[PDB]
Design an enzyme around this catalytic site. Structure first.
Site, mmCIF file in Angstrom:
data_model
loop_
_atom_site.group_PDB
_atom_site.id
_atom_site.type_symbol
_atom_site.label_atom_id
_atom_site.label_comp_id
_atom_site.label_asym_id
_atom_site.label_seq_id
_atom_site.Cartn_x
_atom_site.Cartn_y
_atom_site.Cartn_z
ATOM 1 N N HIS A 13 12.180 17.537 -9.399
ATOM 2 C CA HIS A 13 13.392 16.791 -9.735
ATOM 3 C C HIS A 13 14.306 17.560 -10.684
ATOM 4 O O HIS A 13 14.014 17.674 -11.874
ATOM 5 C CB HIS A 13 12.957 15.467 -10.361
ATOM 6 C CG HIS A 13 14.083 14.529 -10.678
ATOM 7 N ND1 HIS A 13 14.330 14.083 -11.961
ATOM 8 C CD2 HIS A 13 15.009 13.936 -9.887
ATOM 9 C CE1 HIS A 13 15.360 13.248 -11.940
ATOM 10 N NE2 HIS A 13 15.793 13.148 -10.697
ATOM 11 N N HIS A 55 23.952 16.706 -11.930
ATOM 12 C CA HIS A 55 23.621 15.332 -11.567
ATOM 13 C C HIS A 55 24.795 14.372 -11.726
ATOM 14 O O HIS A 55 25.091 13.592 -10.811
ATOM 15 C CB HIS A 55 22.450 14.804 -12.386
ATOM 16 C CG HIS A 55 22.174 13.359 -12.124
ATOM 17 N ND1 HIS A 55 22.762 12.348 -12.850
ATOM 18 C CD2 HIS A 55 21.432 12.756 -11.166
ATOM 19 C CE1 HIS A 55 22.363 11.179 -12.377
ATOM 20 N NE2 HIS A 55 21.556 11.399 -11.352
HETATM 21 O O1 LIG Z 1 17.850 11.314 -10.290
HETATM 22 P P1 LIG Z 1 18.850 10.647 -9.364
HETATM 23 O O2 LIG Z 1 19.851 9.808 -10.137
HETATM 24 O O3 LIG Z 1 19.570 11.669 -8.504
HETATM 25 O O4 LIG Z 1 18.048 9.685 -8.387
HETATM 26 C C1 LIG Z 1 17.608 9.990 -7.074
HETATM 27 C C2 LIG Z 1 16.453 10.981 -7.098
HETATM 28 O O5 LIG Z 1 16.752 12.151 -7.857
HETATM 29 C C3 LIG Z 1 16.123 11.401 -5.686
HETATM 30 O O6 LIG Z 1 17.159 12.302 -5.276
HETATM 31 CA CA LIG Z 2 18.733 13.386 -7.072
#
Ligand SMILES: O=P(O)(O)OC[C@H](O)CO
Ligand SMILES: [Ca+2]
Ligand code: NA
Length: 263
Positions: A13, A55
């Protein structure tokens, strides 16, 4: 096969973001060394139309800049510090070498790793970014990550926007997509909704807090891969794998790599 239901995928992530500032080349390099199957990117677009990895739609949280990414040129964004914020937010994880890290372009990430990484790429706010999907696909094509001798699953495109993913699927039928889902969506999931998702996506990516044994079984019964986000503690990694998810988004890819060997 990366897209096999029998394979458990470690998706780092925003890279190894539990240890390194999110969405920096160094975060992705660290994820690679920690044996992540995928490095995960979130895409924004600059004023002069360049896809970059960040992000938030705004620069404020992870840089020393202010305002919307799309109101700034790439050149101006490249003047920013995208690492120091992490040292400040997490003093106990701070490192001197994080000072002065830069916002990478999509092109730079693909150039850095080439076919040595697998990419899990999210289109953020794509309705606000005309041409995002086409630019993304163009970049993947020129870095030889598309084509029909390409490795299946070497790139997965993901989004909360169904429109974005249907568009990708229409443009590139063999480019696997994963539909992202908030807890509120996942909590009221129906078989009809999952069948619809299955027409353009190979899997679902829900907020893991909305999952239980029953709806994990439900998602899998449709033949969908299941990659919940964002799973950072070991007990939850075990529970989700025991229930039958097929991978996770995690800030701690080293920890998930260890856990998943038991499943
Ligand atoms: O961390 P976010 O806000 O992009 O949430 C979605 C997850 O990362 C999966 O892409
Ligand atoms: Ca994401
Ligand atoms: Na800031």
């Amino acid at each position: 096969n990366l897209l096999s239901p029998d394979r458990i995928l470690t998706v780092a992530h925003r890279g190894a973001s539990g240890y390194v500032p999110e969405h920096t080349i160094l975060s992705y390099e660290t994820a690679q060394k920690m044996k992540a199957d995928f490095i995960e990117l979130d895409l924004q677009m600059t004023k002069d139309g360049k896809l970059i990895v960040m992000h938030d739609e705004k620069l404020d949280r992870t840089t020393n800049g202010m305002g919307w990414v799309k109101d700034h040129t790439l050149a101006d964004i490249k003047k920013l510090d995208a690492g120091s914020w992490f040292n400040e937010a997490y003093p106990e994880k701070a490192k001197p070498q994080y000072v002065g890290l830069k916002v990478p372009t999509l092109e730079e990430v693909l150039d850095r790793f080439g076919k040595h990484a697998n990419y899990y790429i999210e289109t953020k706010s794509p309705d606000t970014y005309p041409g995002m999907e086409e630019k993304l696909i163009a970049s993947l094509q020129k870095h030889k990550l598309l084509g029909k001798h390409s490795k299946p699953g070497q790139v997965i495109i993901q989004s909360f926007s169904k429109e974005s993913l249907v568009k990708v699927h229409q443009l590139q039928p063999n480019l696997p997509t994963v539909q992202l889902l908030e807890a509120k969506q996942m909590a009221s999931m129906t078989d009809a909704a999952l069948e619809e998702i299955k027409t353009y996506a190979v899997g679902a990516g829900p907020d893991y807090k909305a999952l239980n044994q029953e709806n994990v079984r439900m998602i899998r019964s449709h033949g969908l891969l299941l990659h919940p986000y964002t799973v950072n503690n070991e007990a939850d990694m075990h529970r989700l794998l025991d229930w039958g998810v097929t991978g996770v988004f995690t800030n701690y890819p080293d920890l998930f790599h260890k856990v998943k060997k038991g499943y």
